[PDB]
Amino acid sequence: VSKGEELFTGVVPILVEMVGDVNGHRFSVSGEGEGIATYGMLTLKLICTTGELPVPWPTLVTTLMACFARYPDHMKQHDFFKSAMPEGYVQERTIFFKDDGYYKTRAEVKFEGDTLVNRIELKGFDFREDGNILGHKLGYNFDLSDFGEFLKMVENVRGINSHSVYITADKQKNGVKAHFEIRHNLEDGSVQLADHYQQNTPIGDGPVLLPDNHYLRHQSALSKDPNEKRDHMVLQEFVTAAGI
């Protein structure tokens, strides 16, 4: 009913493009898949098109679409991310890795005709060649210490620890913001903290629903395509809103 809902109504094709430079190690990632807001579901296959990804794939999960979360009927007024469509929104993060480097990220999420686009620039700085990021020491998971076709999607995510990020309004920016923590596991059994600060602004001039403070609840699953030669990641995210 409200701005930009009808654009999400079925199966929306996704395009993700990313270019990155972490300590001078240059890389590109492209990818495609599908968002289904009615399920709060996202599925992607993202490929490193330049060869070996120089950071661990788990560290880019958050960077590589809150518009595909499913907002319940009582909360459709708080859906900032759909309300900004089709023109879209700039998503900006700082990510601090404890006792290591950090990422700066800037992405534009928007409709390019039918296709929902996440076009990203990533830089990162002050990493240790030998540390957990440029060392590739993180495990490959995101386990943070229609009734039918849908239940197939939910099967892959049942059991995974949920992760809740609080979304707050920023009136000055006519946007939203969030602070959260991602605790990556390592193989050795300890944790790698990734301290996320996020800012989202509309690309359009005209106004938006600035939401009451609510949470987005995620479960993410990382897998592989068994027929894919390249360095790659399959990511599925189940995202719903609550708490207001």
Author numbering: 5 to 68, 72 to 152, 208 to 306
Any passages from the paper?
Genetically encoded calcium indicators based on truncated troponin C are attractive probes for calcium imaging due to their relatively small molecular size and twofold reduced calcium ion buffering. However, the best‐suited members of this family, YTnC and cNTnC, suffer from low molecular brightness, limited dynamic range, and/or poor sensitivity to calcium transients in neurons.
Compared with YTnC, YTnC2 had 5.7‐fold higher molecular brightness and 6.4‐fold increased dynamic range in vitro. Finally, we obtained and analyzed the crystal structure of the fluorescent domain of the YTnC2 mutant.
